[PDB]
Amino acid sequence: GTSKLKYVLQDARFFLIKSNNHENVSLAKAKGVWSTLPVNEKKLNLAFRSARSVILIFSVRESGKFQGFARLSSESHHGGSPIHWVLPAGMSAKMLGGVFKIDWICRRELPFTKSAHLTNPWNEHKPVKIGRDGQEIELECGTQLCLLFPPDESIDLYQVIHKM
Numbered sequence: 001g002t003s004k005l006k007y008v009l010q011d012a013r014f015f016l017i018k019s020n021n022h023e024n025v026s027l028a029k030a031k032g033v034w035s036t037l038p039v040n041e042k043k044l045n046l047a048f049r050s051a052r053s054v055i056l057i058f059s060v061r062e063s064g065k066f067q068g069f070a071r072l073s074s075e076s077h078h079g080g081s082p083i084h085w086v087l088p089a090g091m092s093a094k095m096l097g098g099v100f101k102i103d104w105i106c107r108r109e110l111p112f113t114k115s116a117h118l119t120n121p122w123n124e125h126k127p128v129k130i131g132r133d134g135q136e137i138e139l140e141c142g143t144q145l146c147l148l149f150p151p152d153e154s155i156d157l158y159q160v161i162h163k164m
């Protein structure tokens with residue numbers, strides 16, 4: 001069903017995450033962590049304090065798809081055991097140094113062809129697939145986008161609801 005999912009998404013904020021490779025999204029699904037560049041790290045930390053739920057919606061660049069979405073369970077933190085991100089050219093471990101804990105809500109894929117009817121007011125009403133890493137997605141667009149994903153029957157939202 002979709003009722004607990006809708007409850008988690010109620011009054012949530014949504015951010016598009018654009019990963020340069022599949023490896024880091026796979027690592028994030030395994031370990032429940034994400035790291036981003038400092039400009040987006042600051043934005044996500046602000047949002048985490050401001051809203052009942054902050055949702056990251058993941059897309060691997062050039063994949064033509066979203067790979068799932070997750071809810072922040074912490075602000076970023078440093079000093080943990082270094083996460084073995086595969087680094088793109090020009091990107092270093094130091095500027096992925098802040099680590100967010102996340103709880104996956106859906107680890108299933110959604111092709112961009114299925115979200116072509118959704119436009120993001122915060123990016124000039126371009127299709128929601130379009131946007132830089134960190135682009136915020138307006139509430140209604142983000143809610144509808146998350147509801148398009150196939151159900152992930154491996155996930156139980158009971159614990160996530162109690163973190164709000």
Ligand SMILES: CNc1nc(Cl)nc2[nH]cnc12
Nearest residue numbers: 018019020021024035036133
């Ligand atoms: C683990 N974080 C990231 N990994 C990759 Cl491959 N690309 C990115 N662009 C913004 N953040 C990232």
